[PDB]
Amino acid sequence: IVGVGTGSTEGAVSSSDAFDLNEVDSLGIYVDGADEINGHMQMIKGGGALTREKIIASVAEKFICIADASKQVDILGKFPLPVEVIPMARSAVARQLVKLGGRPEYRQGVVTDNGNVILDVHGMEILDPIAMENAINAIPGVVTVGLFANRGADVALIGTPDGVKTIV
Amino acid sequence: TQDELKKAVGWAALQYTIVGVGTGSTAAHFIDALGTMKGQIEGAVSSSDASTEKLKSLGIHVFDLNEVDSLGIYVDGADEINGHMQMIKGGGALTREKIIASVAEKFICIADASKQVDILGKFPLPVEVIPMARSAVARQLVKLGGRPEYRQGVVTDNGNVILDVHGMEILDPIAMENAINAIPGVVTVGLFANRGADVALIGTPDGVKTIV
Numbered sequence: 001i002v003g004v005g006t007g008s009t010e011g012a013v014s015s016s017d018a019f020d021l022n023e024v025d026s027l028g029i030y031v032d033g034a035d036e037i038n039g040h041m042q043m044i045k046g047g048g049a050l051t052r053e054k055i056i057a058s059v060a061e062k063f064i065c066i067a068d069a070s071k072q073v074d075i076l077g078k079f080p081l082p083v084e085v086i087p088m089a090r091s092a093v094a095r096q097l098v099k100l101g102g103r104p105e106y107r108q109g110v111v112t113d114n115g116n117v118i119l120d121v122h123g124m125e126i127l128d129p130i131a132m133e134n135a136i137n138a139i140p141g142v143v144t145v146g147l148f149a150n151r152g153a154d155v156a157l158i159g160t161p162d163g164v165k166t167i168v
Numbered sequence: 169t170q171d172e173l174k175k176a177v178g179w180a181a182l183q184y185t186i187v188g189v190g191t192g193s194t195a196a197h198f199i200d201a202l203g204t205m206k207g208q209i210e211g212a213v214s215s216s217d218a219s220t221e222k223l224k225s226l227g228i229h230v231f232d233l234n235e236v237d238s239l240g241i242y243v244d245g246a247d248e249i250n251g252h253m254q255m256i257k258g259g260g261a262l263t264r265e266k267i268i269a270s271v272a273e274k275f276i277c278i279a280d281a282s283k284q285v286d287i288l289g290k291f292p293l294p295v296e297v298i299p300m301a302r303s304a305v306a307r308q309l310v311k312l313g314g315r316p317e318y319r320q321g322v323v324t325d326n327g328n329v330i331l332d333v334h335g336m337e338i339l340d341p342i343a344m345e346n347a348i349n350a351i352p353g354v355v356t357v358g359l360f361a362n363r364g365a366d367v368a369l370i371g372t373p374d375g376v377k378t379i380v
């Protein structure tokens with residue numbers, strides 16, 4: 001049973017409509033892309049979804065990130081960080097995200113599969129992704145934050161002009 | 169009676185605009201009290217549809233939280249409150265209550281004396297979970313030392329399920345709140361520990377005790 005991602009990049013557990021997870025108690029691997037991945041293997045995900053991906057990744061023993069070279073960064077944050085939020089909490093969460101140093105932007109006209117909204121947070125230079133993940137997860141009204149930092153990639157396969165580079 | 173202790177604290181909270189209003193049997197008494205102020209307040213922000221309906225019945229205007237960018241006070245009950253003013257809530261609207269409490273400057277906990285505990289955890293801790301994550305989150309709550317029990321036949325206002333976690337002696341509520349909030353699939357945990365109560369009004373046979 002393999003954990004399978006979403007996006008352009010026995011059976012399986014799948015992260016998008018494009019086994020149900022409750023039917024398994026473990027997954028060997030989860031293979032998925034990312035919007036950004038840093039030198040510490042920490043990622044921003046959710047540009048496309050977010051909650052399903054992070055839950056499946058939490059069950060997999062090994063996260064195998066697959067991406068073209070453009071996704072590699074030194075400091076996470078140029079790509080806006082997605083935060084899924086309970087609708088009634090949108091302005092409250094936005095205020096706290098400003099306090100943490102970001103500029104939250106409501107993703108207009110989009111709802112998640114859970115009926116929530118997304119705030120994409122611009123302008124952060126996320127120097128300590130675990131601390132930032134923890135700070136955003138502390139905010140009442142946050143469902144999921146697209147920082148995969150406490151649980152990042154275990155292996156990354158990067159598509160370069162020269163071939164596939166494997167970073168463990 | 170226990171209900172008269174609840175009534176004492178609900179009314180004592182009037183001592184403390186747009187008012188943040190909680191939910192449950194103790195909060196219900198505070199709403200009665202607030203009704204006596206129908207012509208004096210601007211209105212309220214409510215943590216549940218039941219509270220909204222009661223407020224409206226007493227002529228109090230109910231604003232959505234998104235209509236304010238700040239709240240002076242939030243008055244609500246709790247299932248447990250410890251000596252550090254940290255609470256377990258959610259036995260009954262957990263997500264809405266925690267979001268409103270995050271906006272309010274002053275959280276006033278109203279409770280009868282039975283809610284005071286030295287160590288949180290005898291009352292099972294509610295955890296609201298995305299349905300597809302139920303089993304995964306339960307495995308992690310076991311690893312953290314709890315016994316998660318699916319609250320059968322209940323769904324939250326957000327369409328999620330609740331795991332009530334039994335058997336924890338929560339010696340460090342902030343650490344535990346942070347550990348549960350870290351779990352993918354957790355929406356909200358009913359530990360109010362990073363943001364606890366600022367004032368507690370405890371109803372006792374000797375009168376209402378105020379703890380700040």
Ligand SMILES: O=P(O)(O)OC[C@H]1O[C@@H](O)[C@@H](O)[C@@H]1O
Nearest residue numbers: 007008009033045046047048
């Ligand atoms: O590989 P792509 O098309 O760049 O898509 C990446 C996106 O698909 C998912 O993995 C997401 O988390 C993410 O945002």
Ligand SMILES: O=P(O)(O)OC[C@H]1O[C@@H](O)[C@@H](O)[C@@H]1O
Nearest residue numbers: 192193194245257258259260
């Ligand atoms: O005052 P009561 O009736 O004990 O009700 C307490 C409950 O109502 C709400 O505050 C909840 O968070 C909580 O579980």
